[PDB]
């Protein structure tokens, strides 16, 4: 199906305690493959998947070069942004950046994106044409005009539609086992008494990949949307994800309820009946 490569960058200022903490991570889909942390003794871009360890010394030298250069850029951006919002020197502040490429089912470019944030809020985003910018507020319109005149989007487009998708495809092929194959959810239901007349039915999905999933509870075929507590999908730590959905029901009526599981890894959508 569809695939993506994305790079996330965070730079956090540390008043009175030296340079900003810079952290970069790379993902293909829901799998992390590289990282850089400015506080590690390494001082290098590091592999975080087996399939990226196929890359030779040149990859690790060049990516370390580039991510260090980006580190330095966001260090300056921190100072710049502090001035733009007339903030004092007392507090810590954060610049974040994200970009990357989506390919469709065919493995040909589908979408590109490139955005910043400052202290959590949106700052500037490359618009979907890859040729204009959406400034979030005014101060970002400064950045809009400079980058427009310097032809920043153009080259961004050349990476987005070039090097980005081309290396995604190389990673997709090199990590085939990890990235083109799925883990189907392992599913079950649990029951917990709340009172003598109410009980919680919880529906579990475990060891699934990718993260995208839908868990719903029905009563007599009717969706129980309003009463379903869903937890946020969460990493298991072995490359797979977990999720549950729960509903409180009247004691003695559990057999009315079914759990429904939609996931790419399942050949067809799954119905779990509490009482078969």
């Amino acid at each position: 199906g569809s695939h993506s490569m994305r790079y996330f960058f965070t730079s956090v200022s540390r008043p009175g305690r030296g340079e900003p903490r810079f952290i970069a991570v790379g993902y293909v889909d829901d799998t992390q493959f590289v990282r850089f942390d400015s506080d590690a003794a390494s001082q290098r871009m590091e592999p975080r998947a087996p399939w990226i360890e196929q890359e030779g010394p040149e990859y690790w030298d060049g990516e370390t070069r580039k991510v260090k250069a980006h580190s330095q850029t966001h260090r300056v951006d921190l100072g710049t942004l502090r001035g733009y919002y007339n903030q004092s020197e007392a507090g810590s502040h954060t610049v974040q950046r994200m970009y990357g490429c989506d390919v469709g089912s065919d493995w040909r470019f589908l979408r590109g994106y490139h955005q910043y944030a400052y202290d959590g809020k949106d700052y500037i985003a490359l618009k979907e044409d890859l040729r204009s910018w959406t400034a979030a507020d005014m101060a970002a319109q400064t950045t809009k005009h400079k980058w427009e005149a310097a032809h920043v989007a153009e080259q961004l487009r050349a990476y987005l539609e070039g090097t980005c998708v081309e290396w995604l495809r190389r990673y997709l092929e090199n990590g085939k086992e990890t990235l083109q194959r799925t883990d189907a959810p392992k599913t079950h239901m649990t029951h917990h008494a709340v009172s003598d007349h109410e009980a919680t039915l919880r529906c579990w999905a475990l060891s699934f990949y990718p993260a995208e999933i839908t868990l719903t509870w029905q009563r007599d075929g009717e969706d129980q949307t309003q009463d379903t507590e869903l937890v946020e999908t969460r990493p298991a730590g072995d490359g797979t994800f977990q999720k549950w959905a729960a509903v409180v029901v009247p004691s003695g009526q559990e057999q009315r309820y079914t759990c429904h599981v939609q996931h790419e890894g399942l050949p067809k959508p799954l119905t779990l009946r509490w009482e078969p």
């Binding site: 790079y7 970069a24 790379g26 990516e63 580039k66 991510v67 250069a69 980006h70 850029t73 300056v76 951006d77 710049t80 942004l81 610049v95 970009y99 910043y116 700052y123 500037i124 950045t143 980058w147 310097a150 920043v152 080259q155 961004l156 990476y159 090097t163 980005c164 290396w167």
Partner: peptide
């Protein structure tokens, strides 16, 4: 592969 160019805010 990361994007090569620099260019601050």
């Amino acid at each position: 592969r990361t994007f090569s160019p620099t260019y601050g805010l």
